[PDB]
Amino acid sequence: ASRSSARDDKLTALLAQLDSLTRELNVVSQQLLDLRQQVSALK
Amino acid sequence: QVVDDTKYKDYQQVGILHQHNNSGFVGYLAPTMREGQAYPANFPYPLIGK
């Protein structure tokens, strides 16, 4: 009877991960700007 | 014009319960009477002025 539900499970799996796999990036854009302020602008 | 997600160094984000601005003479979050003291604000980040 089940014929279409298998594709939706990997759809949600690579949406929750696709994002998480984006929180990793979300907090690197600020992480790299934090390290350069210091040395790039002083003295 | 509101603060973006990526730019500022020390600043990151302000919530709803984490507010500081006319939250001494105003209630909790219900229309309840006074429950707090006078303190400087945090949520509305300014660019207008000095």
Side-chain angles (χ1 to χ4, degrees):
Chain A
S2 59
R3 278 155 189 171
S4 61
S5 297
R7 213 157 182 257
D8 201 278
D9 276 61
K10 293 276 186 286
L11 183 81
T12 323
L14 285 317
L15 185 137
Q17 272 201 57
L18 191 135
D19 203 299
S20 270
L21 302 178
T22 315
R23 290 204 87 165
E24 304 286 3
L25 261 135
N26 205 48
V27 313
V28 182
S29 55
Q30 198 208 304
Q31 304 269 240
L32 256 146
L33 203 137
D34 202 288
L35 56 92
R36 307 273 190 201
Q37 224 157 307
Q38 313 173 351
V39 175
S40 61
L42 265 197
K43 308 279 180 187
Chain B
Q1 285 191 253
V2 211
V3 273
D4 62 297
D5 59 297
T6 186
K7 275 280 182 180
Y8 214 82
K9 191 192 175 182
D10 52 72
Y11 173 69
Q12 284 176 56
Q13 58 269 315
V14 189
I16 311 150
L17 204 138
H18 296 277
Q19 264 194 55
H20 242 76
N21 76 134
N22 95 60
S23 272
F25 304 102
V26 161
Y28 196 90
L29 216 62
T32 320
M33 294 185 77
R34 282 202 238 175
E35 44 184 305
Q37 310 295 328
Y39 294 112
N42 53 11
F43 188 81
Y45 255 67
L47 185 55
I48 300 174
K50 286 180 181 180

